[PDB]
Design a protein around this nucleic acid. Structure first.
Ligand SMILES: Nc1nc2c(ncn2[C@@H]2O[C@H](COP(=O)(O)OP(=O)(O)OP(=O)(O)O)[C@@H](O)[C@H]2O)c(=O)[nH]1
Ligand SMILES: Nc1ncnc2c1ncn2[C@@H]1O[C@H](CSCC[C@H](N)C(=O)O)[C@@H](O)[C@H]1O
Ligand SMILES: [Cs+]
Length: 92
RNA sequence: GCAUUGUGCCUCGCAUUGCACUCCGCGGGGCGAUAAGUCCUGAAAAGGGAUGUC
């Protein structure tokens, strides 16, 4: 899948509260650069998954490559590139 | 306080590995509380449920 501004993460611990799951993800991936938003819902379609929207695709790539399979909340993170640009990016 | 309702949150059981920004699994239970909010007020960046009826 082609490099993107947004990394799509899944195999996440569905039992983590939404507000808390976001600030973790943020605090964690801010290592690899600046973050424009994190999209997270705990709906049936969107639980266990998250969208981290980087400012620069370089950041996302280093994030994808470094944090792949990382032990996060007793599960190994599965990180791909998003299949499409996030809305906040296309409006630019 | 009772009716209807928008919008999101938390928990438990079963279920779910799911590509979103067009956003609600089923079922118990608990929620105006800026927590959140996809809903509302305001053109000013912030703020907040609403109509009804004692
Ligand atoms: N019967 C009746 N009781 C009310 C009403 N509003 C508040 N109460 C009383 O208020 C208690 C609940 O508190 P709240 O509803 O939070 O009061 P509030 O938010 O200031 O209510 P409002 O003044 O109507 O905006 C209840 O036990 C009621 O007895 C009302 O409109 N009718
Ligand atoms: N945003 C909010 N903050 C706090 N409590 C809320 C709330 N939205 C709804 N409630 C609670 O839910 C009650 C309405 S019942 C509505 C539940 C929900 N819309 C559903 O369809 O499943 C309110 O009287 C209060 O008990
Ligand atoms: Cs529920």
């Amino acid at each position: 899948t082609r490099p993107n501004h947004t990394i799509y993460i899944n195999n996440l611990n569905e039992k983590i509260k939404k507000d808390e799951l976001k600030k973790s993800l943020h605090a964690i991936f801010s290592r690899f650069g600046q973050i424009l938003d994190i999209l997270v819902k705990r709906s049936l379609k969107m639980r266990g998954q998250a969208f981290v929207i980087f400012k620069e695709v370089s950041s996302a790539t280093n994030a994808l490559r470094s944090m792949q399979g990382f032990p996060f909340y007793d599960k190994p993170m599965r990180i791909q590139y998003a299949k499409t640009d996030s809305d906040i990016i296309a409006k630019m």
